[PDB]
């Protein structure tokens, strides 16, 4: 498998290659690295049988109970 | 205005800023003048000005965060 991230917010595609997200969706992340530099920040993922690109700032790892701090420690929320 | 880096990012181009998760980023422009550069923002990290992907930051460095769907949260 690939890592599974969770959508934080709804996202509505603006084009046909973009993946629609709704809050709480589990997204399998297939690539975090755009081939074209102008697309950096968009990740490829799969949800619901569909594969497309989505903005990385709409997803998180898990549900929020554990936080990774800037200094690399973990905390409970 | 202060933003926070969401992810580590290692740059691979000229003028691009290194990000580490949790960095404070001061955003200078949210709008590339050229169409090829749309999606990249200009800002300053650690005293250095350069560009970075917009989607690798979130707004706010204190108790209130602004999400990209236009909502606000307590951090």
Author numbering:
A (entry chain A): 42 to 118
B (entry chain B): 44 to 118
What does the paper say about this structure?
The newly identified binding surface is composed of an extended n-Src loop (located between β2 and β3 strands) of the MLK3 SH3 domain, which opens up to bind a peptide ligand, named “MLK3 SH3–interacting peptide” (MIP), which lacks the canonical PXXP motif. To determine the structure of the MLK3 SH3–MIP complex, we constructed a fusion protein MLK3 SH3(41–105)-MIP(1′–19′) where the prime denotes residues of the peptide. The structure of MLK3 SH3(41–105)-MIP(1′–19′) was solved to 1.2-Å resolution and refined to an Rwork/Rfree of 13.6%/15.8%. The interaction of the SH3 domain of MLK3 with MIP occurs between two protomers that are related by crystallographic symmetry. The MIP binds in a pocket formed between the n-Src loop and β-strands 2–4. Most notably, several hydrogen bonds contact Trp-10′ in the MIP sequence. The backbone amide group of Trp-10′ interacts with Asp-74, and the carbonyl group interacts with the backbone amide of Ala-76. The Trp-10′ indole nitrogen atom hydrogen bonds with the carbonyl group of Trp-83 located on the edge of β3 strand. Gly-8′ and Arg-12′ also contribute to hydrogen bonding; the carbonyl group of Gly-8′ interacts with the hydroxyl group of Ser-72 in the SH3 domain, and the guanidine moiety of Arg-12′ forms a salt bridge with the side-chain carboxylate of Asp-80. To accommodate MIP the n-Src loop undergoes a dramatic conformational change.
MLK3, also known as MAP3K11, is a serine/threonine protein kinase involved in regulating the JNK, p38, and ERK pathways. It is composed of several modules: an SH3 domain, a kinase domain, tandem leucine zippers, a Cdc42/Rac interactive binding (CRIB) motif, several linker regions, and a proline-rich C-terminal tail. The SH3 domain has been implicated in the autoinhibition of the kinase domain through an intramolecular interaction via a nonconsensus single proline motif located between the leucine zipper and CRIB motif in the full-length MLK3 protein. The overall structure reveals a five-stranded antiparallel β-barrel, a characteristic of all known SH3 domains, and three loops (RT, n-Src, and 310 helix), commonly involved in the recognition of both proline-rich and nonproline ligands.
